[PDB]
Amino acid sequence: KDILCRLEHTTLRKVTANTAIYYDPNPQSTVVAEDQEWVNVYYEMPDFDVARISPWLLRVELDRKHMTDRKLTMEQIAEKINAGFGDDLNCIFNDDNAEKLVLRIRIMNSDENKMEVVDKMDDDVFLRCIESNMLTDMTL
Amino acid sequence: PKNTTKKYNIMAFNAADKVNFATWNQARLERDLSNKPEDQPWLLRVNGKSGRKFKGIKKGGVTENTSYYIFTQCPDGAFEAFPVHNWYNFTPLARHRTLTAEEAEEEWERRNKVLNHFSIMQQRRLK
Amino acid sequence: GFVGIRFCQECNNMLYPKEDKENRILLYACRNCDYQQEADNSCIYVNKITHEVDELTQIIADVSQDPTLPRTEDHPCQKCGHKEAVFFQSHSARAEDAMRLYYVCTAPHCGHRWTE
Amino acid sequence: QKEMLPHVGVSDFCETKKAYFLGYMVHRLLLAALGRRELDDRDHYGNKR
Amino acid sequence: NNELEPTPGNTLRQTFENQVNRILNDARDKTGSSAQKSLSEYNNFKSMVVSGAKGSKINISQVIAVVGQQNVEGKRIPFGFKHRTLPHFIKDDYGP
Ligand SMILES: [Zn+2]
Ligand SMILES: [Zn+2]
- How many Å apart are CA C17 and CA C3, to the nearest integer? 12
- Report CB contact under 8 Å: B112, A118: yes
Phi and psi at D9, nearest 5°, equal 160, 165
Which residue blocks in chain D are alpha helix, DSSP H?
A: 15-34
Q: In chain C, which residues touch E (CB < 8 A)?
A: 66, 68-70, 87-89, 91, 95, 97-101
Q: Tell me which residue of C20, C26, C30, C22 sits closest to C44, measured CA to CA.
A: C26
Task: State how far the alpha carbon of B34 is from the alpha carbons of B40, B43, B50, B55, D1, in Å.
Answer: 6, 7, 20, 9, 18
Helix, coil or strand: residue A60: strand
Q: CB-side exposure of C106: number of CA atoms within 13 Å? A: 18
Q: Tell me which residue of C55, C51, C112 sits closest to C88, measured CA to CA.
A: C55
Q: What residues contact B48, with CB distance under 8 A and at least 6 apart?
A: B27
- How many Å apart are CA D32 and CA D39, to the nearest integer? 6
Flag whether A touches B (3+ CB pairs, 8 A cutoff).
yes
DSSP for residue D46: G
Phi and psi at A96, nearest 5°, equal -75, -20
- How many Å apart are CA A40 and CA A28, to the nearest integer? 8
Which residue blocks in C1-116 are alpha helix, DSSP H?
A: none
Flag whether C11 is marked binding.
yes
Q: Strands B88-92 and C85-88, how do they pair?
A: unpaired
Task: State how far the alpha carbon of B83 is from the alpha carbons of A69, B9, D22, in Å.
Answer: 73, 9, 32
E1-9 long-range contacts (CB < 8 A, ≥24 apart) are E2/C98, E2/C99, E2/C100, E4/C99, E6/C97
- How many Å apart are CA B34 and CA B40, to the nearest integer? 6
Task: State how far the alpha carbon of C62 is from the alpha carbons of B80, C68, C113, in Å.
Answer: 42, 13, 11
Contact A126, A83 (CB under 8 A): no
- How many Å apart are CA B98 and CA B126, to the nearest integer? 11
- How many Å apart are CA A74 and CA C65, to the nearest integer? 49
Q: Tell me which residue of B99, B105, B93, B95 sits closest to B126, measured CA to CA.
A: B99
- How many Å apart are CA D48 and CA A130, to the nearest integer? 46
- How many Å apart are CA A19 and CA A61, to the nearest integer? 6
- How many Å apart are CA C49 and CA C68, to the nearest integer? 33
CATH 2.20.25.10 fits C48-116, yes or no: yes
- Report CB contact under 8 Å: C88, E91: yes
Report yes or no: D16 at the B interface, CB cutoff 8 Å.
Answer: yes
Phi and psi at C112, nearest 5°, equal -85, 145
Helix, coil or strand: residue D29: helix
- Residue B57: its H or E element: strand B54-58
Q: Tell me which residue of A33, A101, A105 sits closest to A73, measured CA to CA.
A: A101
Handedness of CA E19, E21, E26, E31 (dihedral sign): positive
- How many Å apart are CA B87 and CA B68, to the nearest integer? 10
Cα–chain-centroid distance for residue C10? 28
Report yes or no: B41 at the C interface, CB cutoff 8 Å.
Answer: no
For B96-120, letters b (16+ CB in 10 Å) and e give eeeeeeeeeeeeeeeeeebbbeebe
Q: Strands C85-88 and C71-72, how do they pair?
A: antiparallel
Helix, coil or strand: residue B80: strand
Best mutation target, B38, B42, B57, B91, to test chain D (most D CBs within 10 A):
B57
- Residue C71: its H or E element: strand C71-72
Helix, coil or strand: residue A124: helix
The chains found to touch B (3+ Cβ pairs under 8 angstroms) are: A, C, D
- How many Å apart are CA E45 and CA E60, to the nearest integer? 7
Strand partners, B11: B88
Indicate the domain borders of chain C: 3-47, 48-116
Contact B118, B106 (CB under 8 A): yes
C-alpha dihedral, C16 to C21 to C24 to C25, nearest 10°:
-20
Find the C32 Cα to ligand 1 centroid distance in Å: 7
- How many Å apart are CA A61 and CA A102, to the nearest integer? 5
Provide the CATH number for the domain around residue A7.
Answer: 3.30.1360.140
Question: Total structural domains in chain A?
Answer: 1
Residue of chain C with shortest Cα separation from B16: C12
Q: What is C32-55 written as a DSSP string?
A: SS----B-S----B---SS--S-S
Q: Tell me which residue of B4, B6, B17, B10 sits closest to B94, measured CA to CA.
A: B17
- How many Å apart are CA B107 and CA B104, to the nearest integer? 9
Nearest to C16 among B16, B115, B123 (CB): B115
Q: What residues contact B96, with CB distance under 8 A and at least 6 apart?
A: B52, B53, C10, C11, C33
Q: Tell me which residue of B15, B7, B5, B3 sits closest to B70, measured CA to CA.
A: B7
Domain that holds residue A52: 1-137
DSSP for residue D35: T
Contact A99, A55 (CB under 8 A): no
- Report CB contact under 8 Å: C45, A31: no
Task: State how far the alpha carbon of A134 is from the alpha carbons of A65, A73, A75, A84, B65, in Å.
Answer: 21, 17, 17, 9, 57
